[PDB]
Symmetry: C2
Subunit: 258 residues, 2 copies
Amino acid sequence: LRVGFIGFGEVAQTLASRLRSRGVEVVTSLEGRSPSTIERARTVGVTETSEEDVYSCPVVISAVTPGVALGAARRAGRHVRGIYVDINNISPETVRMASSLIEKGGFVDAAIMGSVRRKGADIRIIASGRDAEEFMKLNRYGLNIEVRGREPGDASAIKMLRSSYTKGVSALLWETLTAAHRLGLEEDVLEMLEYTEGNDFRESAISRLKSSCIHARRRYEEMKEVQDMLAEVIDPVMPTCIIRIFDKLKDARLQGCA
Amino acid sequence: LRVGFIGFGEVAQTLASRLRSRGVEVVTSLEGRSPSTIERARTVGVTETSEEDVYSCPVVISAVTPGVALGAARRAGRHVRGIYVDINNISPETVRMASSLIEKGGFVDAAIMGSVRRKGADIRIIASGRDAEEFMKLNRYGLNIEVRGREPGDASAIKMLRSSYTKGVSALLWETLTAAHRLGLEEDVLEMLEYTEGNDFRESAISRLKSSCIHARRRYEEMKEVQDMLAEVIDPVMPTCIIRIFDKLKDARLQGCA
Ligand SMILES: NC(=O)c1ccc[n+]([C@@H]2O[C@H](COP(=O)([O-])OP(=O)(O)OC[C@H]3O[C@@H](n4cnc5c(N)ncnc54)[C@H](OP(=O)(O)O)[C@@H]3O)[C@@H](O)[C@H]2O)c1
Ligand SMILES: NC(=O)c1ccc[n+]([C@@H]2O[C@H](COP(=O)([O-])OP(=O)(O)OC[C@H]3O[C@@H](n4cnc5c(N)ncnc54)[C@H](OP(=O)(O)O)[C@@H]3O)[C@@H](O)[C@H]2O)c1
């Protein structure tokens, strides 16, 4: 059929390109969009149309910025009658609000579970909501979707919970290795760990260490979000310490000096 | 030659038994020791001798209790001229002080990296200090020693750092899964984690979770020690929150209840 995209950045380009290569007609509205967006669209060769025509597609995918997710849902919510797929990196609470704005359509919470830069359209996408199985039918056109949870908010929650764990582990590794570094024992500690944490441990370990530091500010903000989502369900103990570690984080051994 | 043991409890029995079966004469002093200790000694068949005769052995191993380690070193240090191997669970700084008490001998910081109970004499032991290589010669007699670090305190630090990391991950896992459970998403989070943490994750995680809950009381006490040990080297942030989780912890899904 036709799949319309709200926004046409990196995610929309990768996804649209794949769908197009499998015979799907992809459409987007370029009115008011930047030259970079207009160029990605023209590189892919998507159908240029009006906003309301985009909203008429049986599947509409919102791939804008986290800060624009609610506004896109509000503008689309007045017209979309098919399925509206929000694939933005937003919190479960924001997803539920976006869902309330889609008044006549079926809302699907999609969460990208990997790097679009490294995996392309083969990236694993999880989706939740009553209409998720309908979105998953796009797997016939080259996508890699899987249905998880039961309602909008669940897919984004799984992604947030996984990310929460991985950020906490990164913070723990940093504190552990800074102490090891003061004694000159970081390598020995890393080697004792590969004994019980796995074979490919040390590799991704150093990798996560470096990125946790480069993006300390961003990771800190992500942690405030996880603290809020967890509080709705439990009384969160770990985020507070993790945040303190990221607060501090503002040749891998060089990330350990202080 | 002759290996002397100060203290003759579970650790000493296990190691002495292995050494004896490989032809080493093992000796210890039973004066002032309890019935259970005298019994372990006679079950193994150790040579009963004077306190000073023990100190004369080329290798003297101190396997007493943490609260007795410094006193044992003070007494042995007036006599030992061979190698004094401290295998007690004391902080790295306590090990360094025990080292200063062996005034005429070489000191080796040995650290047991597993369960004596489950692995027996096959347990991996890491050892640090100038004379660590000399202690490692006992591998010829059935032990499993490996040299790490460079000076007394390094082996104990490495052990405590590994412990700090593995206990922190258990707490992070528990909190993440308990929140996931309240949303009915625990399996999804677990599958997403193995879909990213490579290794059999889901399995290595469910077991770590179970053990952490079963032994929550001991884990809590163990974390207080880790916190104190980390404090000798840095101003630790993570143990505070980790301790709060173990404070709470006192079919996998059953454990996720806060
Ligand atoms: N890239 C990744 O690896 C990745 C991974 C996981 C999740 N995500 C998520 O998926 C979403 C899209 O990511 P992305 O990298 O493609 O972003 P870009 O930020 O790469 O592209 C989004 C593009 O959305 C447009 N936009 C902003 N406001 C808009 C509005 N009111 N109406 C229509 N379009 C609007 C922009 O057009 P203009 O340029 O003209 O403003 C923009 O091109 C994000 O929410 C992000 O968190 C991305
Ligand atoms: N068991 C393990 O899996 C394990 C693992 C890692 C580290 N460690 C450490 O290694 C050491 C020994 O462990 P363990 O399990 O064998 O303990 P026990 O507690 O099994 O044995 C210690 C034995 O030391 C003796 N002792 C107490 N005060 C003494 C003194 N002043 N002089 C001489 N002997 C004295 C006792 O004699 P009495 O019975 O007469 O009191 C005692 O048998 C400890 O520091 C412990 O923390 C043990």
